[PDB]
Design an enzyme around this catalytic site. Structure first.
Site, short mmCIF file in Angstrom:
data_model
loop_
_atom_site.label_atom_id
_atom_site.label_comp_id
_atom_site.label_asym_id
_atom_site.label_seq_id
_atom_site.Cartn_x
_atom_site.Cartn_y
_atom_site.Cartn_z
N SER A 89 1.25 -5.74 -2.16
CA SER A 89 0.11 -5.05 -1.61
C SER A 89 -0.02 -3.73 -2.27
O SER A 89 -0.81 -2.90 -1.78
CB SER A 89 0.26 -4.81 -0.13
OG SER A 89 0.27 -6.08 0.50
N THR B 167 0.91 -1.13 0.00
CA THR B 167 0.00 0.00 0.00
C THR B 167 0.95 1.18 0.00
O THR B 167 1.72 1.36 0.92
CB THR B 167 -1.01 0.04 1.12
OG1 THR B 167 -1.63 -1.16 1.46
CG2 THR B 167 -2.04 1.13 0.88
N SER B 168 0.81 2.07 -1.07
CA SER B 168 1.76 3.16 -1.14
C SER B 168 0.99 4.32 -1.57
O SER B 168 -0.04 4.16 -2.22
CB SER B 168 2.99 3.00 -1.98
OG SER B 168 4.03 3.95 -1.71
N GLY C 67 3.83 4.42 3.09
CA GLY C 67 3.45 3.07 2.71
C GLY C 67 4.50 2.16 2.98
O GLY C 67 5.46 2.49 3.65
#
Lengths: 195, 232, 226, 196, 242, 244, 246, 204, 241
Positions: D168, D1-2, D128
């Site tokens: 992710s 997740t970024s 992230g």
């Protein structure tokens, strides 16, 4: 450790309690008292966690004796036993538990019989005519019921008690130094010494 | 009227509060005190009283601190409360900042204290005025506290009984005590003169004077007895 | 369990199994796991059954109170946010997981709530421990701008597929079609691939097979005045 | 997740990957991390999805009460609110938040707030778990005051690299361009982005 | 007596005198407000008063932006106008994120009606002396007008007015709906709704106004904005020559 | 008269709170205090009367600071006047911590006026008995308010309060007519002084002291600071010149 | 004296219970008639100017899904009290009891809220006296009056507001032991047309019933183990029909 | 293991045609020690029966608590509580302690007076509506009682035929459980008549 | 002056507020308790009546405080209403703690404490309710009390409150027997009630009754509210209808 015995016979409740009060790895005093009167016809033997026993006894003594003065007459065993159970039920939901088990042996004067209650350290009340806690109920629930007959008297229940003390002395690794036996009948509470 | 008394929460038709106006009188009914000062010293001289010849007199100087202290003029029960909060604020300054409190800064804290009761329902305007003396980083200073809570810097001022006369003395001699510097005696001796003017049907007595002086190099000091008998 | 959420062109449908299992023992073969929040807002419980039914009821009352307050039907967002700020306070110390879905005059909306306070918006969701199971059918036979028939079928196949793979499910499938401008059609026992078979031997015994110690008659009724 | 945000001459463009991951299972592969908290200020979310979601609600609520009571707010004002919620609650909630908005009197601006809460002005920010991998990519191909297209492209490339080396990071690359002309949203499919 | 001096004590008539006094406090800034509904808008005009010249004449306001899409006009006193503003903005804001959607004209106005009633049930607080009129375009009820009285009463309107010379305005709005046979304004761009509302105010008092003598707030679909004085000017000359 | 005062939150059949109006009567009795808005600053001037020669002048001010950019000056009762600035000071401090930017000048007017308002709302506590002129320079430029003890505030180009308020507003009236722009900051220092000279012809018994403070964008650097020295001498010479 | 909330008069009672009662009497006439398969509840509207909308006003407010209420007295106090009843109905007895409460029970909880606002001094009693009518499976259909005093009475028919006395004698005459629900509506209209005639018509008269369940107004279908709402509100058109039928 | 499993107690309800049966053991044990052989776990409020399984302290505390609440309801409303409304009530009351919940597993059984229908419902620790119209079981041996009841069950039974079905189920499931047995009792509610029949069985 | 709050007493140490609360009692109708050796009857009379008042399927001045003890109400029903609830709470509280039902004496004694406290402390008002308590306990038998709104109690063998207090006390004691029976308590109840009631007729819609009986089987204390149809027959018997 810290035996307390109850047996109910057909004219008395005979409660007994230890005289060993053990604080440490050393029995702190040889001969003591460990059963106290709530009322002139209700008697409460106690044992449980160390130090909780003195505080708890005195507290219940004060509630029964207060109520008895308000009514102007002595409260029934039913009413005493459900009072005691409440305090422990409340304590197990609170942050200070009190892990003390009692036996309430009174004589009801409105119904004409002995009533013996067993009140657990959890706080559970159930009526039983051979009660006990600790490592006393481990030898004595069986032995008291062996010679037990439906028709009994103080004298037959006493013979049967003394016998229990001796069983315990034999197979437990705990010196109780004997027991005091207090008899409860409609004629008051009296100490009778026993072996 | 004068029915708007018994309320500190009701403005009168002229926007005064009677509770505060009556409090100015309240001061007058107490003892006289003169403050005066220079850049090197600050002094309070206060009239002690006896109500019977079996009294050893009663002091009217409360030590706030070891660089400050204060006098009263007006009601003694009102005074005791004010001096407690005041002592506290000097203790705070020392504790947290390793600082000593300024006379002006202390007086702005006491200025607030008064107004808490004046706004609210119940409570009192205070009936006593304090003259606060201390010595900080800004020298000697002298403040005058009111029922209202109003704070006023003066080089010398007087409150209490027939104190308008002592202020007249001070006004004439204005420059004299501002110019006196480095002599603690001289601010003390002037103080004696001012409170003489205040006294009516009486004269200066040793057992009456209590003298307190704090200075540059001098810590707070309260003279009484046989130490004001050389300033008589 | 296994809950599916499938939107469509005129509404949104929530469907879930009626099997309630706590631990390895199936507690109830039939019990509704679809909880009503509001008249045309519904939710479905997975995870801890106790937590799910209790919370939806309590919260549901508030939403009802809001409906009355507004003189309009509730919002699906009103339900979601109320839930979200309740479950958050605890910080995951209530194990509730719900798909909230419902209809409004501002559309059909689909949401997930979590214990910790997390959320998901899609146009298909699946939730439970058989979330993995249902998902597969939902991705692989989805269509943009579904019809009413198509969604009812997709929701039921995804649950049926999960009965076979996730053992939390089985029994019956319950389905709630929530269509805009119209009543929400509760279709319980929609799809039922389970069947309660007949006994191989009938189990009965005549009166008195059990041994009776004593008998008594007790009363639950007030006694006459004489 | 970024999540990341890049300043440019005309504004600031916020970029994100849209995957929500609990553990290592995907809840929803399209739920975006760019959430609107003001008319001209948007925020980015990373760490626990739950903890960040609630935190935004409080900020959003404050800033709307600030717009009526005390006039409209800025990016500078917007940042600080998240930070106090993060600084007090610095063990109760875990939240990396990027706050990027557009002003006409300061242009686009970027503040990043780390997990324990601290105030930082940076010209671009990256947060992230995928942000770690693409850190040196961004340092080198970032320029100040650049063309609108090279900005689109630079964010598009950096997140595409995060997808490549973090599991992710994926979904779609979604973008929110904040300008004086309002808001323009953009979407980029893996078929476009990943080849590159 | 004791008892028109007491907020919560009833008189010998069962009447609450305190309540009645708020209706006689609300013309203490001597202004008349007019709001009417288009079909895509609700427009609010109150006259400005800038009695002293020592004022900065452009920081005089009576129309308040309360929330994003929701405005309010106050008739009555300045000390109670501000308190009313703080509560309506606070509560307007609080709803939005609590219930996770844009807040109605109606829900907000009931909530203030309820708020005012609690303040008058209790004696520790008093009735406010402002009469509030809410204006918005709702995204689920359209064009709306709610006038909330300081007794805690509320009722809707098709068009409304407030002030000390409300009656002339009342008559203009009644004869318009008698003739039109509709409950809005038939002009369908909000610019012509501004002009219309002006004309009814200019006529009703008898004197034209200036732009330093009006203020206009304009509610459009999911929006609110307050017009500046030079946009107001475009409107007045729209009056002078059509 | 009798009825509907005794309390400050009881209306009358005329809709008017009596106690509160007496609050304004208290502000008249206090000293002549004025503030001037300029298009780059604000200038605050005050008549602090000299009540004795034993007073120490220009060391007891009715100027107070809020944050480090908002000037304040009060009319009315002096320690009530302290108390309300104190409130200002807690809000300044609190706002600056949370948002990490100074208090906007419009933001400030709203917040103060509301504490004044919580005390006109309850029957039990008294209202304030002071007006406060205030303003400064912020990011949205200079702005000037005067807040009445009634609960009211407005923008002003020139605001006046106190006894000599009739004369001071008449002079201010020339200042608005003659400069629509509110006048430059530098000339408004010498102006602020002139008005206080002409307004102490109504407090002529006593002696006075002029203390001046200002906040200006490019000359006090957006922050509040005291006016002293050559500048102060000039404000004095100018006033003097034109009273004569 | 008559004249605080604390003080009892030289011949007992509180004068503030009585002043509150007087406040109801300046209200707008409401009435209830209990029928033998339903309850009809009927009231009038009269509001402000002709400019005012009266369709944005509810003087018939459902308390719960099964139980409606009306008032007479102060308009403002009604909305706050309706607001307080709905919330309390839910909180003690829809959460801790999970379903819609009995009519009798709810009437009792309402009365106790009124009495608590007389109890504490510096808080006046409510301006209004309600009629609350509803249904449950244990007490049936029921009709009640709750006075601001804090006491409640069941009734067969009663009326409150300005029109009270004229209505009452009409009900003694036209009422019977049994009524149908339709018969009950025309009897309701006749009575309420005494309080005002020249402003009576079915678009300005607000009426509701607590009669049958409804399957179209429940909002969901296929569960016949719940009940549709007992309360149904009659619209403007529905009232206009029943009046040609009277 | 869990506090409920130490002390023991089972409760089982079952439905027949227009009847319900609710039955239990009598054994109270704490740990391994047997205390009693004559404490019931079945109570009743009105005509509505409550059994409670689990940790002995909460069985006693909840017997007093639910006796205090159903009587305040009865006194107020002046009529009987019903099984339908009580199903809602029990869950509510349990959910109150979340961070110290009562370690119990109730069973409610009863026949409604407003339809005459038989009704059962089941509850866990913190309580929820668990609906059956088959049977509900709870307690340490709920896992033994779930299988053995299902088999023996034939939907819709006479009151006297239902006595056999509940009895044979309970006996052997209790017996092959450590902390259950020691005497049992059956309450058979026909409708307004309750017969109480004590099972002969092996005391262990 | 002295007609002021609770806390303020009076030029004699009286309190004018208690006396105005007593007078509140006779603005609502006649209520009588008669103890007899075979049961206690409690009676109250309606305070309001109309032909459209529904009062034969309701009570409003007979309340259960448990399952042995009941109360009849006289006075304000709005003061009564809050107090009836608190009374019932205390009565079930003895159930919950001690596993016996409350004595009649303790239930009476607590409410004397509650009434007294609102007068003693604070500036809150006294109430206006007289409760006649009829109960059973095994140690005292049949027991009767009555409560003033003052915060004290006296036990009695018969008692009247409500409107026409002297007249009723006079009729009660005239034919009051010291053995008696319950059927004899019912007959005196009707007799006393009629004469006191300003309306010449006395009918079932004007009467409430509950009787507490132990002559209704021994070992069991049964509370019996007589229904409307049982009141009509005993009016025939006594001559009233």
């Amino acid at each position: 450790m810290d035996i307390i015995l109850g047996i109910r016979v057909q004219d008395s409740v005979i409660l007994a309690s230890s005289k060993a009060v053990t604080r440490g790895i050393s029995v702190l005093k040889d001969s003591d008292d460990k059963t106290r009167q709530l009322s002139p016809h209700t008697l409460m033997s106690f044992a449980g966690e160390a130090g909780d026993t003195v505080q708890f006894a005195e507290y219940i003594q004060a509630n029964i004796q207060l109520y008895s003065i308000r009514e102007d007459y002595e409260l029934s065993p039913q009413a005493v036993s459900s009072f005691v159970r409440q305090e422990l039920a409340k304590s197990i939901r609170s942050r200070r538990p009190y892990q003390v088990n009692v036996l309430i042996g009174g004589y009801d004067k409105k119904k004409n019989k002995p009533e013996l209650y067993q009140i657990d350290y959890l706080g559970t009340k159930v009526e039983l005519p051979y009660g006990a806690h600790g490592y006393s109920g481990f030898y004595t629930f069986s032995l008291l019921d062996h010679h037990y007959r439906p028709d009994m008297t103080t004298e037959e229940g006493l013979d049967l008690l003394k016998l229990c003390v001796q069983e315990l002395e034999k197979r437990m690794p705990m010196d109780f130094k004997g027991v005091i036996v207090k008899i409860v009948d409609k004629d008051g509470i009296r100490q009778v010494d026993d072996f | 009227r004068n029915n708007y008394d018994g309320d500190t929460v009701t403005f009168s038709p002229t926007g005064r509060l009677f509770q505060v106006e009556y409090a100015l009188e309240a001061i007058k009914q107490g003892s006289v005190t003169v403050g005066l000062r220079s850049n090197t010293h600050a002094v309070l001289v206060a009239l002690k009283r006896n109500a019977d010849e079996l009294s050893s007199y009663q002091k009217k100087i409360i030590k706030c601190d070891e660089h400050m202290g204060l006098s009263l003029a007006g009601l003694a029960p009102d005074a005791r409360v004010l001096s407690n909060y005041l002592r506290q604020q000097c203790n705070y300054s020392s504790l947290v900042f390793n600082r000593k409190l300024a006379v002006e800064r202390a007086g702005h804290l006491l200025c607030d204290k008064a107004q808490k009761n004046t706004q609210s329902y119940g409570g009192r305007p205070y009936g006593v005025g304090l003259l606060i003396i201390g010595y900080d980083k800004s020298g000697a200073h002298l403040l005058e506290f009111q029922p209202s809570g109003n704070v006023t810097e003066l080089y010398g001022t007087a409150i209490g009984a027939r104190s308008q006369g002592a202020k007249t003395y001070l006004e004439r001699t204005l420059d004299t005590f501002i110019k006196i510097d480095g002599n603690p005696d001289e601010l003390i001796k002037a103080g004696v003169e001012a409170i003489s003017q205040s006294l009516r049907d009486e004269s200066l007595t040793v057992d009456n004077l209590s003298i307190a002086i704090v200075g540059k190099d001098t810590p707070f000091t309260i003279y009484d007895g046989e130490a004001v008998a050389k300033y008589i | 369990t296994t809950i599916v959420g499938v939107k469509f062109n005129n509404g949104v449908v929530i469907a879930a199994d009626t099997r309630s299992t706590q631990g390895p023992i199936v507690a109830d073969k039939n019990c509704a796991k679809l909880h009503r929040i509001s008249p045309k807002i519904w939710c479905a419980g997975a995870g801890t059954a106790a937590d799910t039914e209790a919370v939806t009821q309590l919260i549901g009352s508030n939403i009802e109170l809001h409906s009355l307050y507004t003189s309009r039907e509730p919002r699906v967002v009103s339900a979601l946010q109320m839930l979200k700020q309740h479950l958050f306070k605890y910080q995951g110390h209530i194990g509730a997981y719900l798909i909230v879905a419902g209809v409004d005059p501002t559309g059909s909306h689909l949401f997930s709530i979590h214990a910790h306070g997390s959320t998901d918006v899609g146009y298909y969701l699946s939730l439970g421990s058989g979330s993995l199971a249902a998902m597969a059918v939902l991705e692989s036979h989805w269509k943009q701008d579904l019809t009413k028939e198509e969604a009812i079928k997709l929701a039921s196949d995804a649950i049926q597929a999960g009965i076979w793979n996730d053992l939390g499910s089985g029994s019956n499938v319950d389905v709630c079609v929530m269509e805009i401008g119209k009543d929400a059609e509760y279709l319980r026992n929609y799809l039922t691939p389970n069947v309660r078979e007949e006994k191989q031997k009938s189990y009965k015994f005549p009166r008195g097979t059990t041994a009776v110690l004593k008998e008594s008659i007790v009363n639950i009724c007030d006694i006459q005045e004489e | 997740t970024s999540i990341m945000a890049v300043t440019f001459k005309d504004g600031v463009i916020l970029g994100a990957d849209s995957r929500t991951t609990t553990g290592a299972y995907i809840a929803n592969r399209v739920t975006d991390k760019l959430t609107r908290v003001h008319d001209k200020i948007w925020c980015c979310r990373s760490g626990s999805a739950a903890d960040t979601q609630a935190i935004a609600d409080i900020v959003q609520y404050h800033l709307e009460l600030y717009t009526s009571q005390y006039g409209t707010p800025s990016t500078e004002t917007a940042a600080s609110v998240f930070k106090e919620l993060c600084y007090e609650n610095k063990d109760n909630l875990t939240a990396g938040i990027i706050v990027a908005g557009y002003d006409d009197k300061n242009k686009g601006e970027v503040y990043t707030i780390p997990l324990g809460g601290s105030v930082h002005k940076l010209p671009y920010a990256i947060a992230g778990s995928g942000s770690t991998f693409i850190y040196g990519y961004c340092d080198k191909n970032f320029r100040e005051n650049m063309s609108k297209e090279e900005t689109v492209d630079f964010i598009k490339h950096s997140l595409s690299q995060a997808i490549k080396w973090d599991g992710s990071s994926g979904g779609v690359i979604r973008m929110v361009v904040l300008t004086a002309a309002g808001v323009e949203r953009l979407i980029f499919y893996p078929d476009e982005y990943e080849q590159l | 007596a004791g008892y028109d001096r007491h907020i919560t004590i009833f008189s010998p008539e069962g009447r609450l005198y305190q309540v009645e006094y708020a209706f006689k406090a609300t013309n203490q800034t001597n202004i008349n407000s007019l709001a009417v509904r288009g079909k895509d808008c609700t427009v609010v005009i109150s006259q400005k008063k800038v009695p002293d010249k020592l004022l900065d004449p452009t920081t005089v306001s009576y129309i308040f932006c309360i929330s994003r899409t929701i405005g309010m006009v106050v008739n009555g006193p300045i000390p109670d106008a501000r308190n009313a503003a703080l509560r309506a903005k606070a509560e307007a804001a609080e709803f939005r994120y609590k219930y996770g959607y844009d807040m109605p004209c109606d829900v907000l106005a009931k909530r203030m009606a309820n708020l005012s009633q609690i303040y008058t049930q209790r004696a520790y607080m008093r009735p406010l002396g402002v009469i509030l009129t809410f204006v918005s375009v709702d995204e689920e009820l359209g064009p709306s007008i709610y006038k909330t009285d300081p007794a805690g009463y509320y009722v809707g309107y098709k068009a409304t007015a407030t002030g000390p010379k409300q009656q002339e305005i009342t008559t203009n709005l009644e004869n318009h709906f008698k003739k039109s046979k509709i409950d809005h304004i038939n002009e369908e761009s909000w610019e012509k709704v501004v002009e219309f509302a002006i004309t009814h105010m200019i006529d009703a008092l008898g004197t034209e106004f200036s732009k330093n003598d009006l203020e206009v707030g304009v509610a459009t679909k999911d929006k609110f904005f307050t017009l500046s004085a030079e946009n107001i000017e475009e409107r007045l000359v729209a009056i002078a020559e059509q | 008269g009798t009825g509907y005062d005794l309390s400050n939150s009881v209306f009358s059949p005329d809709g008017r709170n009596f106690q509160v109006e007496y609050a304004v009567k208290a502000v008249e009795n206090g000293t002549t205090s004025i503030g001037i808005k300029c298009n780059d600053g604000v200038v605050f001037a005050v008549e602090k009367l000299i009540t004795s020669k034993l007073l120490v002048p220009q060391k007891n001010v009715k100027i107070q600071v809020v944050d480090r950019h908002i000037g304040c000056v009060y009319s009315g009762l002096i320690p009530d006047g302290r108390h309300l600035v104190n409130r200002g000071r807690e809000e300044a401090a609190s706002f600056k911590k949370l948002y990490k930017t100074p208090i906007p000048i419009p933001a400030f007017a709203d917040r103060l006026g509301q504490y004044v308002q919580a005390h006109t709302l309850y029957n039990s506590v008294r209202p304030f008995g002071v007006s406060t002129i205030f303003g400064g320079v912020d990011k949205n430029g200079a702005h000037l308010y005067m807040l009445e003890p009634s609960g009211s505030y407005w923008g002003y180009k020139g605001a006046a309060t106190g006894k000599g308020r009739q004369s001071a507003k008449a002079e201010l009236e020339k200042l608005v007519d003659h400069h629509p722009e509110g006048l430059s900051a530098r000339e408004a220092v010498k102006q602020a002084a002139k008005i206080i000279y002409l307004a102490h012809e109504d407090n002529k018994e006593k002696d006075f002291e002029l203390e001046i403070s200002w906040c200006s964008l490019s000359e006090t650097n957006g922050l509040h600071k005291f006016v002293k020295g050559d500048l102060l001498q000039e404000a004095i010479d100018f006033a003097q010149k034109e009273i004569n | 004296y008559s004249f605080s909330l604390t003080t009892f008069s030289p011949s007992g009672k509180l004068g503030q219970i009585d002043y509150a009662l007087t406040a109801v009497k300046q209200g707008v006439t409401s009435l209830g008639i209990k029928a033998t398969n339903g309850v009809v509840i009927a009231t009038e509207k009269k509001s402000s100017s002709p400019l005012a909308m009266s369709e944005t006003l509810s003087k018939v407010s459902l308390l719960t899904p099964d139980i409606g209420a009306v008032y007479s007295g102060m308009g403002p106090d009604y909305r706050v009290l309706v607001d307080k009843s709905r919330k309390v109905a839910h909180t003690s007895y829809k959460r801790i009891y999970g379903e819609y409460p009995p009519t009798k029970l709810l009437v009792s909880e309402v009365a106790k809220i009124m009495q608590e606002a007389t109890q504490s001094g510096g808080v006046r009693p409510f301006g209004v006296s309600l009629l609350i009518a509803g249904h449950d499976e244990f007490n049936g259909f029921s009709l009640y009056q709750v006075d601001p005093s804090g006491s409640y009475f069941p009734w067969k028919a009663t009326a409150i507001g300005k029109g009270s006395v004229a209505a009452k004698t009409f009900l003694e005459k036209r009422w019977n032991d049994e009524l149908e629900l339709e018969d009950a509506i025309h009897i309701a209209l006749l009575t309420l047309k005494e309080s005002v005639e020249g402003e009576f018509n079915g678009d300005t008269i607000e009426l509701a019933i607590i009669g049958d369940e409804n399957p179209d107004l429940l909002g969901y279908t296929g569960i016949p183990t719940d009940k549709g709402p007992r309360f149904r509100k009659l619209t403007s058109q529905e009232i206009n029909d029943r009046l040609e039928a009277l | 293991s869990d506090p409920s499993s130490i002390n023991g107690g089972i409760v089982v309800a079952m439905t027949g045609k227009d009847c319900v049966a609710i039955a239990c053991d009598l054994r109270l044990g704490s740990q391994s020690l047997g205390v009693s052989n004559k404490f019931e776990k079945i109570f009743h409020y009105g005509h509505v029966f409550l059994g409670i399984t689990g940790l002995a302290t909460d069985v006693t505390t909840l017997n007093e608590m639910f006796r205090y609440k159903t009587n305040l309801y009865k006194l107020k409303e002046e009529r009987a509580i019903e099984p339908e409304t009580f199903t809602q009530l029990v869950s509510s009351s349990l959910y109150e302690r979340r961070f110290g919940p009562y370690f119990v597993g109730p069973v409610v059984a009863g026949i409604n007076s407003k339809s005459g229908k038989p009704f059962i419902a089941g509850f866990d620790l913190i309580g929820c509506i668990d609906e059956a119209k088959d049977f509900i079981v709870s307690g340490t041996a709920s896992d033994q009682l779930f299988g053995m009841c299902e088999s023996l069950y034939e939907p819709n039974l006479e009151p006297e035929d239902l006595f056999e079905t509940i009895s044979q189920a309970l006996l052997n499931a209790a017996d092959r459980d450590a902390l259950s047995g020691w005497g049992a009792v059956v309450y058979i509610i026909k409708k307004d008549e309750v017969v109480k029949r004590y099972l002969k069985m092996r005391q262990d | 002056r002295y007609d002021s709050r609770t806390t303020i007493f009076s030029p004699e140490g009286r309190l004018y507020q208690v006396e105005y609360a007593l007078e509140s009692i006779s603005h609502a109708g006649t209520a009588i308790g008669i103890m007899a050796s075979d049961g206690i009857v409690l009676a109250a009379e309606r305070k309001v009546t109309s032909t459209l008042l529904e009062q034969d399927t309701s009570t409003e001045k007979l309340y259960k405080l448990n399952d042995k003890i009941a109360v009849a109400v006289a006075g304000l029903t709005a003061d009564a209403e809050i107090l009836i609830n608190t009374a019932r709470i205390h009565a079930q509280n003895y159930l919950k703690t001690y596993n016996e039902d409350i004595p009649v004496e303790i239930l009476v004694r607590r409410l004397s404490d509650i009434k007294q406290g609102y007068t003693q402390h604070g500036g809150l008002r006294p109430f206006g309710v007289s409760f006649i308590y009829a109960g059973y306990d095994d140690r005292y038998g049949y027991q009767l009390y009555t409560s003033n709104p003052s915060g004290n109690y006296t036990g009695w063998k018969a008692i009247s409150v409500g409107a026409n207090t002297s007249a009723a006390q006079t009729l009660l004691q005239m034919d009051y027997k010291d053995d008696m029976k319950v059927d004899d308590a019912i007959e005196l109840a009707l007799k006393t009630l009629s004469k006191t009631t300003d309306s010449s007729a006395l009918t079932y819609d004007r009467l409430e009754f509950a009787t507490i009986r132990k002559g209704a089987n021994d070992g069991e204390v049964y509370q019996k509210i007589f229904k409307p149809q049982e009141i009509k027959d005993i009016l025939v018997k006594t001559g009233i209808t």
